[PDB]
Amino acid sequence: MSVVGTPKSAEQIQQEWDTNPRWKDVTRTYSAEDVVALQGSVVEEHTLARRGAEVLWEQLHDLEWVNALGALTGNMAVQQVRAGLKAIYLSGWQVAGDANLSGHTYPDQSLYPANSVPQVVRRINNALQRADQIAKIEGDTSVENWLAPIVADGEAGFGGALNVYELQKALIAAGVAGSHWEDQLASEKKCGHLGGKVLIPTQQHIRTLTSARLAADVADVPTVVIARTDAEAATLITSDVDERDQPFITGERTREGFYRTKNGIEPCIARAKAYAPFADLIWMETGTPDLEAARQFSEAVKAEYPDQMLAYNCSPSFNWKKHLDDATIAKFQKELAAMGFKFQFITLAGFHALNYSMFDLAYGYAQNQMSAYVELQEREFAAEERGYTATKHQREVGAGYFDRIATTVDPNSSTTALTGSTEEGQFH
Amino acid sequence: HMSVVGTPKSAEQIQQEWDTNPRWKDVTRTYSAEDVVALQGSVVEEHTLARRGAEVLWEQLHDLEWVNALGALTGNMAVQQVRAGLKAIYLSGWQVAGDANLSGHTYPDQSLYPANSVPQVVRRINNALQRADQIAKIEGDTSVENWLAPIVADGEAGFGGALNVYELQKALIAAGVAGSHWEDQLASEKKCGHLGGKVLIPTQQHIRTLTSARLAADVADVPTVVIARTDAEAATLITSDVDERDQPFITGERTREGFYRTKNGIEPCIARAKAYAPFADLIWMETGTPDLEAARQFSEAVKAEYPDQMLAYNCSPSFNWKKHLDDATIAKFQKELAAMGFKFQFITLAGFHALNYSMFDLAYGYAQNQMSAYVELQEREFAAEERGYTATKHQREVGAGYFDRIATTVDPNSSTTALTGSTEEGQF
Amino acid sequence: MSVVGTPKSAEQIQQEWDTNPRWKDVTRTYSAEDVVALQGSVVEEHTLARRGAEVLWEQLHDLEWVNALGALTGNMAVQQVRAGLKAIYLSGWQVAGDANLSGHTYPDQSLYPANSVPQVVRRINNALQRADQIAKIEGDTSVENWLAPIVADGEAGFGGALNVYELQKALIAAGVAGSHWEDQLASEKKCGHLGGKVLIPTQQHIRTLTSARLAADVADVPTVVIARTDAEAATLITSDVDERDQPFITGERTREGFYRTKNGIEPCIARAKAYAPFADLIWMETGTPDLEAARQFSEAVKAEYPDQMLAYNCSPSFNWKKHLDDATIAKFQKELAAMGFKFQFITLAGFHALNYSMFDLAYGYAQNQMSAYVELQEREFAAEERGYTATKHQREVGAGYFDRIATTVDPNSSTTALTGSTEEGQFH
Amino acid sequence: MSVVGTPKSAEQIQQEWDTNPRWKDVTRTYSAEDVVALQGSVVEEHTLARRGAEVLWEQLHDLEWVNALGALTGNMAVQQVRAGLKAIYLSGWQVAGDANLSGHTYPDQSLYPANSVPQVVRRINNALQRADQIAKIEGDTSVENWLAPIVADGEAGFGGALNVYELQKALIAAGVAGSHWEDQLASEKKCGHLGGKVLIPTQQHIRTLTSARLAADVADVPTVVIARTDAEAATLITSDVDERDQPFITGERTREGFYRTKNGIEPCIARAKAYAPFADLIWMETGTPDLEAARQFSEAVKAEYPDQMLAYNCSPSFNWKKHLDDATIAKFQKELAAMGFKFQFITLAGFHALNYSMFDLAYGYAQNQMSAYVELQEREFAAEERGYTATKHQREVGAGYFDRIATTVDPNSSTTALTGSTEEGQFH
Ligand SMILES: O=C(O)CC[N+](=O)[O-]
Ligand SMILES: O=C(O)CC[N+](=O)[O-]
Ligand SMILES: [Mg+2]
Ligand SMILES: [Mg+2]
Ligand SMILES: [Mg+2]
Ligand SMILES: [Mg+2]
Ligand SMILES: [Mg+2]
Ligand SMILES: [Mg+2]
Ligand SMILES: [Mg+2]
Ligand SMILES: [Mg+2]
Ligand SMILES: [Mg+2]
Question: List the disulfide bonds (chains A, C, D).
Answer without folding.
Answer: none
